[PDB]
Symmetry: D3
Subunit: 151 residues, 6 copies
């Protein structure tokens, strides 16, 4: 049995994140989205859940402390995340090698879909709160809350 943990702050979750969730869900038996700010923990969870109803083998859970302890305790087998740029890679390479060193846990990376390469939660927030239309970059459950939260 295999299991991928996808860790992050998801504040908020983007269509880029969901694309990675979908791609991890097709290769692993279970996916756990581990949520480690604009939105509360509770809202971040609902946003992820409402955006992933089409993924029966995925669940969302709050995480505390080292991602590797989360992986080992819950019997998962790998960490999975997306990479957009060579700069993403150098940063994530450090964390992955450190995680391999301390716990023997492997990290698998997948390349962003080209259409979401420029998306970050932080940029989407900064733009959305200034009137920019980032609706095509985020799941509708997130768009709802941004519209409300900003009215």
């Amino acid at each position: 049995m295999t299991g991928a943990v996808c860790p992050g702050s998801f504040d908020p979750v983007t269509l880029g994140h969901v694309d990675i969730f979908e791609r991890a869900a097709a290769q692993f038996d279970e996916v756990v989205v581990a949520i480690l700010g604009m939105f509360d923990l509770d809202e971040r969870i609902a946003m992820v859940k409402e955006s992933t109803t089409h993924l029966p083998n995925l669940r969302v859970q709050v995480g505390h402390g080292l991602v590797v302890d989360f992986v080992r305790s819950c019997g998962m087998t790998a960490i999975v995340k997306g990479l957009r740029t060579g700069t993403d890679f150098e940063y994530e390479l450090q964390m992955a090698q450190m995680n391999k060193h301390i716990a023997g846990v492997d990290t698998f990376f997948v390349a962003t879909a080209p259409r979401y390469s420029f998306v970050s939660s932080s940029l989407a927030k900064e733009v959305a709160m200034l009137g920019g239309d980032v609706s095509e970059l985020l799941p509708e459950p997130v768009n709802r809350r941004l519209r409300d939260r900003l009215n």
Copy 2:
């Protein structure tokens, strides 16, 4: 059922490659090493086989044409390869997105072990043929053939 294809020229296979094979073999049901020069096809195959006897769910096969056609025809589910540097990533990102575009096939990357980050088949060859000791960087089945081939 899941399956990872690890494609490359493997001329020759290195301990870095084997590390990736091992890590793919722990997450996927089968691994196929697809061999796409210093050594003949036949020798490259034996070198890979002799270096992976400890991996029962791995097999070696010659590949022709697009890696994605190999993946789809044989019912495999993903391409897996290692990345050493941000420059590896930018090059492999192009191929991965192109492969996703033409065939819907996903590529999962894993970070090199730190001790092999500077290893390439080409550099190992150029150095070995000049008297440099690269034996700690390559499997013993490869070292044997380099010693012979160079006597």
Copy 3:
């Protein structure tokens, strides 16, 4: 009066190139595509011409020697090209600074459209000639010739 030269081998021209042509044509009075292999010079020209009929202020011309001499002789005012990655940038930065040094000619770069970030003429060719469908990445005038050329 302003003029941008867009230099390259265009073997063949891609939808990524055309996107840059369009964006240069909106800021400059004239655009000259300077064509500096799979296709003949004559075919490369027709492919560019047939792909740019919607750009009245753009023309195609064969180029020989330094791009800066082409710019100065024909009274153009800048070189314009696209960038996909940080690695594109470092290479093109060298040429741009050298061109500024020898001739005082400035180069303006524009970021690729995200959907074409992984496109190169060379990769498109290698894939197309192996049966891969790259038709969505190239103008129809190019697709025609690839289909013919490969039948």
Copy 4:
């Protein structure tokens, strides 16, 4: 009619910035320097104005909110900025593609002059306030204020 907006914090403006202003002013009908800390808004403006008296088609203006809204409202046609490194490019590539997505506004980049590649406002400030001579990196109107401000 064409117009380039050059946005930034300009705290303070450097000779690198001025070089880009000059190069934008030669290709566009108007340039607007949009000023979006060590110096007040008022001082930043004077410093830019006093450093650009030789550019009749350039004006300085305070900016609020999205740069793209500034461009569209004032009938400008492009954003123009400098790039020093591949790392500058990856960061600015994200903003440029986001700006293209939300507003259709294009960004043109120009490579730094080699002599200013290591210049940043932040590094110049940190060094100047410690006695280092950064006078050759900044316009005299800025040097005046640094000398005063630091006496």
Copy 5:
């Protein structure tokens, strides 16, 4: 007579730092570790001293202000530091060229040992304080204090 200054915050010093100290000590007559937070200045000094007893030509000293003023005042001849990634290089390249500009002081870089490429003081701290075993990445004098400090 030659002298290398190795500047940094060393909070705490790592085995990666010590490797660089050793390599600088073999090429220069003297090495000065200049200490410019988790640990006090006093503790940082002891940790460096206790970790370098095997280097008779190395001494540790607190630094204030520009590293170049430290180098010139004490008659040293160069700054020496390690680089892990291309991103380290671009950042350190800026500081090195600025230091050359203001004071004529040269900086020599050495590549990290592969086994420490993923090590940073900040990552080691964050992990150690969460129960992760980073003991193989740090000198025993540092490990002692982390164990104490965290009991």
Copy 6:
């Protein structure tokens, strides 16, 4: 006693190379320029010699095989080279770590002078042979031979 070897093809030597020679010569007792095409070996040597008459502790020598064997045999203590970009660094990092692995020989890097960051022997040649004035980028002994060689 210390000694730096500066290895390369020097076809031809540039002002960027000479800047590095000068900076190595100020920190090491001897510098050996090891010459490992447009110009003959004999001419490359004369060009380097004529360009370095102001460096009494520098000599030029032809090199064969591994640079590390050259260093060890002649009792030198380090390899020294310049770096222009993060991409230079990633490539040279591989060679440096391989050289450390096989022979224990360390490599020290120095950052290019900003004014020569875009200079390469290959680009200078391609441009010079097309009429471009690269004379300010190369030593006069090289300029002489390019003028002759191209008349």
